[PDB]
Amino acid sequence: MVSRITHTNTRGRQVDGVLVTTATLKRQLLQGILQIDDTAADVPVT
């Protein structure tokens, strides 16, 4: 528990998690379910 490298969305906010592999389900509920929005970014380079 503290905040040095813990990302956010885009007005003040720390993070906690992961996952890893490949191809057919995540971009597999776009031809099915999810949403979309916007145009910003940030995270330390140290």
Add this chain to the structure above:
Amino acid sequence: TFIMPMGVFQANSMDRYTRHAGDFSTVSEQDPRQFPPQGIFFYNKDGIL
């Protein structure tokens, strides 16, 4: 594991029960459709038993 039985004929005589009718027996007079089971016609991948 899933595990596949294949040989008996129950010597019941307990649980007669049913779902279908008088639509049915085989062609002629007397009604034996009492086959229990012998071994197995089964499929494969994509069309074929």
Add this chain to the structure above:
Amino acid sequence: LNRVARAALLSDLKRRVCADMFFMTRHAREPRLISAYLSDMVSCTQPSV
């Protein structure tokens, strides 16, 4: 790929060609599926120089 991998890499070829044969005139009533395999078609060839 080895005998099995070849084997129904082959056989899935068989199913797919039996199923996804006339997709534009079979699944005409579902606009969603059309874009569902079109993106597959475009994202299955490797780009060039």
Add this chain to the structure above:
Amino acid sequence: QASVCEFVAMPVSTDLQYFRTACNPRGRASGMLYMGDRDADIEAIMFDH
């Protein structure tokens, strides 16, 4: 254009449930798709009984 139908002889007490998929008219399937370790495997597949 009328299409010709060719007849092949076969036993009467032949499996009938053999003909409700993509089967092979020869009665024993073959094909070049069938190897992986040796080269003279196409002949024994198609004819070795």
